[PDB]
Design a protein around this ligand. Structure first.
Ligand code: DGL
Ligand code: DGL
Lengths: 254, 260
């Protein structure tokens, strides 16, 4: 398309703002259209065909509006629909699983890699299968279903949530992982808590951070960066559910 | 006072507006902590100053924050930590967290080939604070490079494209030749270049964010001393102050806080 076209970003809800904020941090001149599917999410407890239906509806709307690139900020939606998206859209698609996978394989020292995410992300085996091409690595994947509710309620330090994480992460500790993928939009807000649980030696990998660096790479190489001397960037935020409820909760992630 | 009340605020200070990346990362982790942030826009940038000039500026702000009763002090500025951390250990009795040591410990743990790079202001690099802090790390080789233009590039919003890539390829060339696989972003502004730097350094280089590691340290410190502000306390208060022009601080802060 045109370098002046927006970047589309979408998510199951409000937590994908961690990805959007990281993209905007790296790319202050890009126009952005963010859509959070608060009308139909959370995607965490849904089935894969349910998630794909919801995500592709938003994907089709954003591509229909002329975005030059589509970013799937939700790890659950990335599991359910990257296959479809590759073939369905002609714009480049960035998502949140593969940039982290590549970072984790480069960052590990003993080859033992963990990943945490929603039930739907972990049950899909997107991470387990994506890591199968990595020589000399052992993957341990664990769903952490209550993490999302604790992040949104703002309860991310202290004894209650620390015990919750110790119970979730025990298999990763037992497996002696030295690298841990935060495979969910909400989990960067728990990186201090998770690091305390896992100890100093474990490298945490943020989906938001790696994906934003990948958007920089992708727009640079296909020569579609919106120019610095273009007008001030426009950033549009839309919700499929209650816009006022979205605005209230977004303060937690912005 | 080692131990103030858990209801006391956390003090964060910086040479100006760039330390908001550290304060935002702290607030991300710790939504129920009261924050007082002071950014020394009236005397910055610290990057081109001497160590004694930086120290005197920074301690004047630490003195204010401590006198307000903060329960912990975060030196968010890598130039300032280089110049005054030593003084702050004796001058202040509340816990002091800063941005050099957490990233050093991370870098030591994250490297695979033992080759570690660090970039920062001229003051930070020529102080040898990173070179000396790494001396205890056996089987490591440190390469340190000052990147003086990175700060104004970040602040004026120019962080991708050919111009800033060519500028970054020139700075980072010694690190590529040294074959580092780990790079400490030893400056407050550099997280806003991490995509540009990752692109110049290749995919095998692990970038280490001062903001991120220091925020995780604050979570750990407050937890282990049991000084976390409780979730059922009133909503957290977050004060941001500038020693220089208030309207310029607000305009520049937009770059580091992100969309409203
Ligand atoms: N955005 C989702 C988390 C919230 C949800 O379950 O909808 C994810 O990254 O997996
Ligand atoms: N805060 C400074 C960058 C800006 C300045 O030079 O004052 C640092 O982290 O080194």
């Amino acid at each position: 398309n045109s370098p002046l076209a927006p970047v589309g970003v979408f998510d199951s809800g409000v937590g994908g703002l961690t990805v959007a904020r990281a993209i905007i941090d790296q790319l202050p001149d890009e126009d952005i259209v963010y859509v959070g599917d608060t009308g139909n999410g959370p995607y965490g407890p849904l089935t894969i065909p349910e998630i794909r239906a919801h995500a592709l509806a938003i994907g089709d709307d954003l591509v229909g509006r002329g975005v030059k690139a589509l970013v799937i900020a939700c790890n659950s939606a990335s599991s359910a629909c990257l296959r479809d998206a590759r073939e369905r859209y002609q714009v480049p698609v960035v998502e949140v699983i593969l940039p982290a996978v590549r970072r984790a394989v480069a960052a590990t020292r003993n080859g033992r890699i963990g990943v945490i995410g929603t039930r739907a992300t972990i049950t899909s085996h997107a991470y387990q299968d994506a890591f199968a091409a990595a020589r000399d690595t052992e993957i341990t994947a664990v769903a952490c279903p209550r993490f999302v509710d604790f992040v949104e309620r703002g309860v991310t330090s202290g004894r209650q949530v620390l015990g919750l994480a110790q119970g979730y992460l025990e298999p990763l500790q037992r497996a002696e992982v030295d690298t841990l993928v935060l495979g969910c939009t909400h989990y960067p807000l728990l990186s201090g808590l998770i690091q305390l649980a896992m100890g100093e030696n474990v490298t945490l990998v943020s989906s938001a951070e790696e994906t934003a660096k990948e958007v920089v790479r992708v727009l640079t190489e296909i020569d579609l960066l919106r120019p610095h001397d273009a007008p001030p960037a426009t950033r549009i935020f839309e919700a499929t559910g209650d816009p006022e409820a979205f605005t209230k909760l977004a303060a937690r992630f912005l």
